[PDB]
Amino acid sequence: MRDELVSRSLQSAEHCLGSQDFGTAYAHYLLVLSLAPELKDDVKETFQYTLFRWAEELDALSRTQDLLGCYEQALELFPDDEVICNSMGEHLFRMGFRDEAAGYFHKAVKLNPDFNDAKENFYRVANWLVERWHFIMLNDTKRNTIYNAAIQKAVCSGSKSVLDIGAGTGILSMFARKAGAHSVYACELSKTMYELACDVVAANEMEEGIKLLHMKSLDIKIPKHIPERVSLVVTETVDAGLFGEGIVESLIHAWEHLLLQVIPASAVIFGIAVECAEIRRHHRVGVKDVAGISLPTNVKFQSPAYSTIEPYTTEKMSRVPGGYLALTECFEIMTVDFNNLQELKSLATKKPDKIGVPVIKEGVLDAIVVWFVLQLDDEHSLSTSPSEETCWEQAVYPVHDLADYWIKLGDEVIMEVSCQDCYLRIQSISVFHSECVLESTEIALLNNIPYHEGFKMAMKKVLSSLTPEKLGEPLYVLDVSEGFSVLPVIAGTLGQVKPYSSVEKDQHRATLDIICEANHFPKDTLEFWLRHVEDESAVLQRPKSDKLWSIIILDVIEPSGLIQQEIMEKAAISRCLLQSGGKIFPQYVLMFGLLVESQTLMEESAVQGAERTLGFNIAPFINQFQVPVRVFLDLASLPCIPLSKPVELLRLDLMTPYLNTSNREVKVRICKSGQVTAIPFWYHMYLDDEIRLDTSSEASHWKQAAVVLDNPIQVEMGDELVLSIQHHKSNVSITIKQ
Numbered sequence: 057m058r059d060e061l062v063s064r065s066l067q068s069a070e071h072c073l074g075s076q077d078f079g080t081a082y083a084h085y086l087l088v089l090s091l092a093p094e095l096k097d098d099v100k101e102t103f104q105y106t107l108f109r110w111a112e113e114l115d116a117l118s119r120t121q122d123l124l125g126c127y128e129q130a131l132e133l134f135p136d137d138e139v140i141c142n143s144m145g146e147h148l149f150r151m152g153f154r155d156e157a158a159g160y161f162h163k164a165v166k167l168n169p170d171f172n173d174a175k176e177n178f179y180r181v182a183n184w185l186v187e188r189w190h191f192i193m194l195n196d197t198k199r200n201t202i203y204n205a206a207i208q209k210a211v212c213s214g215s216k217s218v219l220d221i222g223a224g225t226g227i228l229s230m231f232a233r234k235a236g237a238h239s240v241y242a243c244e245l246s247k248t249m250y251e252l253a254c255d256v257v258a259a260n261e262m263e264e265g266i267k268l269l270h271m272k273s274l275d276i277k278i279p280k281h282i283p284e285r286v287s288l289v290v291t292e293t294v295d296a297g298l299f300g301e302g303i304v305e306s307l308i309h310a311w312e313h314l315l316l317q318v319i320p321a322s323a324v325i326f327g328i329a330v331e332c333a334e335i336r337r338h339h340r341v342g343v344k345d346v347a348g349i350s351l352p353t354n355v356k357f358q359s360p361a362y363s364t365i366e367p368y369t370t371e372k373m374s375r376v377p378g379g380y381l382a383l384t385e386c387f388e389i390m391t392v393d394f395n396n397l398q399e400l401k402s403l404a405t406k407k408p409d410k411i412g413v414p415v416i417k418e419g420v421l422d423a424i425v426v427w428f429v430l431q432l433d434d435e436h437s438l439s440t441s442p443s444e445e446t447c448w449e450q451a452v453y454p455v456h457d458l459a460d461y462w463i464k465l466g467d468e469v470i471m472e473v474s475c476q477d478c479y480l481r482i483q484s485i486s487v488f489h490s491e492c493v494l495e496s497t498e499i500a501l502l503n504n505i506p507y508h509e510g511f512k513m514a515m516k517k518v519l520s521s522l523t524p525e526k527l528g529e530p531l532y533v534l535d536v537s538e539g540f541s542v543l544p545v546i547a548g549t550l551g552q553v554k555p556y557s558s559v560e561k562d563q564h565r566a567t568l569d570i571i572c573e574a575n576h577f578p579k580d581t582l583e584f585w586l587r588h589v590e591d592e593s594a595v596l597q598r599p600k601s602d603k604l605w606s607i608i609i610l611d612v613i614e615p616s617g618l619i620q621q622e623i624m625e626k627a628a629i630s631r632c633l634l635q636s637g638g639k640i641f642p643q644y645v646l647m648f649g650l651l652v653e654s655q656t657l658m659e660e661s662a663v664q665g666a667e668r669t670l671g672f673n674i675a676p677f678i679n680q681f682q683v684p685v686r687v688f689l690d691l692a693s694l695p696c697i698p699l700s701k702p703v704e705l706l707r708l709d710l711m712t713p714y715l716n717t718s719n720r721e722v723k724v725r726i727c728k729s730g731q732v733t734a735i736p737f738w739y740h741m742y743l744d745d746e747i748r749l750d751t752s753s754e755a756s757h758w759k760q761a762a763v764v765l766d767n768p769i770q771v772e773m774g775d776e777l778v779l780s781i782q783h784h785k786s787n788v789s790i791t792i793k794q
């Protein structure tokens with residue numbers, strides 16, 4: 057009764073499926089599969105479904121506890137099966153368990169290193185886990201050298217017990233240990249960071265006096281974790297705005313619990329007022345008419361200038377597209393002594409304070425650029441000014457709501473400063489002349505005029521071509537652009553047009569209707585197509601009738617610089633909903649790129665060996681999380697050396713299916729001798745065969761991307777290389793051959 061008496065579990069699991077019961081079905085399928093390897097492929101997909109829905113049931117009951125073990129059993133049943141590994145990793149990633157799905161993606165890649173989707177998902181998980189700026193920090197030789205010198209000077213002064221807050225890779229704890237610290241303790245909130253910090257400390261042979269903890273500093277207890285109050289506290293929990301990573305609260309906790317009567321010792325914040333057209337394009341709507349659509353003055357847009365995410369942006373002002381003008385002189389904003397618990401407490405209960413700065417160059421007030429000097433001690437200090445090429449960035453406070461932004465010689469800039477929520481907040485920015493929440497990409501979209509001009513022209517062309525008078529009931533226009541878009545309002549002016557906007561914000565819909573009224577629109581015209589209860593994007597149907605669409609504005613390019621996923625599938629869906637003459641915008645897309653030499657991209661993607669880290673071996677452990685593509689790039693101010701001519705890497709036709717090829721190859725003319733390190737790329741969107749939008753143009757809101765290489769390639773002027781390009785459904789892969 058071992059062979060026959062089995063699949064009664066299967067016949068009961070069918071009944072359980074009929075009753076929406078997945079636990080009994082999962083257990084029955086476990087019984088059937090673990091007793092019959094012959095059925096592993098017969099009920100593969102049904103078991104997959106059963107386990108997915110049972111895991112959803114378990115997550116609804118807050119039973120991750122056993123959900124992870126259930127997924128582990130599912131793996132145990134199927135050994136080398138990269139398909140199940142990948143699919144289950146995506147299901148774990150979807151439920152919010154990235155720290156756990158990372159291992160499943162790693163195993164899926166280990167079973168087949170050529171699995172496309174496995175690697176393309178592992179890169180997502182690694183980008184979410186390890187943060188990019190870490191790579192820029194470990195490669196800062198100046199930062200590492202100065203921190204090592206300061207920690208050594210502190211240890212030689214009598215500090216034998218050192219605690220590292222925000223240890224990350226544990227390189228600061230290793231600096232302390234190598235300097236001769238007796239007791240070294242480190243803490244890091246991230247699971248993955250603790251994970252590879254263990255590896256780094258072990259391989260560098262320092263697990264003796266370095267005790268690692270997986271917790272925030274605010275969770276440390278004495279003597280439960282560390283046995284005593286330490287004599288030294290090191291940390292690098294600082295950002296562009298210093299307080300952005302919460303050093304104040306952590307150091308208040310450290311002085312109140314874990315310290316004897318701190319590196320860094322102090323900080324002096326400096327600021328300046330800058331003119332910059334790019335910052336203005338990203339954080340201020342300059343134009344008041346958008347291709348014939350008048351924006352009313354009572355509807356004022358703003359960027360995330362908050363009043364709880366950062367109320368400022370971060371920019372590398374040392375390489376801003378175009379440049380920047382210093383309208384004033386570098387002036388002090390505040391000073392923080394990290395060896396002052398009184399001041400650290402008073403900053404929370406501190407009221408704002410005003411500062412006035414004179415103008416030295418007449419221009420346009422566009423932003424407030426803020427950096428700081430981190431005083432490790434009386435000797436060592438690290439600056440983050442744009443004149444210094446370090447790893448850090450500069451904080452940028454935008455300037456909203458002023459009658460005139462022109463400042464002259466003799467005027468001042470008056471501003472309040474406050475650190476009331478441990479976040480550097482500069483407010484009340486005004487100029488005494490001497491006697492909607494749109495994102496940065498949305499602001500730059502409104503500021504981008506050629507986009508709207510070309511869209512209006514192509515829309516008018518197609519609409520007039522579809523009207524019966526020239527073809528020999530109003531026309532329907534669909535806009536599925538992700539975010540704010542005035543394209544439906546533009547289309548509404550071109551005759552009997554029914555525009556549909558997929559914008560999902562209530563605020564944005566109200567604003568679009570107010571703008572329509574400002575343009576004397578019948579309010580019934582602009583209909584908002586936010587249709588769903590829980591759908592990712594506005595899934596594509598026809599209107600209330602099957603009267604097929606005339607114009608469908610798809611979203612093809614992600615503002616990160618990559619091609620937006622499910623593009624060809626959504627285009628194939630949309631092609632069936634067009635009438636005999638309809639159009640999908642864009643009509644096609646040409647992906648262009650070139651080969652360059654950039655040390656900047658190399659050091660942005662991965663760590664450059666023990667050179668930068670001063671002997672300590674950290675690159676092999678952290679470069680496991682390096683990704684092949686840099687996103688959100690401005691090729692306008694990219695520090696590199698071009699090595700070839702820009703060529704077409706890909707074509708993507710959205711009206712024609714059978715065109716968009718797969719494994720294409722391109723021959724590239726190497727027109728300069730050097731070292732290929734990366735492949736930047738951008739796009740040209742052809743709406744009409746005449747009209748073209750250049751995503752690399754300095755008026756575009758989009759960003760460019762770049763495939764960064766692991767090992768730089770040596771080439772000479774006159775050589776010709778080959779590039780293999782794959783458009784795998786929702787991803788683009790660019791590999792090289794000599």
Ligand SMILES: Nc1ncnc2c1ncn2[C@@H]1O[C@H](CSCC[C@H](N)C(=O)O)[C@@H](O)[C@H]1O
Binds near residue numbers: 223246271273274
């Ligand atoms: N109070 C705290 N306790 C533990 N980790 C913290 C923390 N505050 C911030 N962090 C984390 O520490 C990380 C900083 S890494 C900064 C230092 C760098 N890893 C080095 O040793 O050279 C951030 O990812 C942040 O999330």
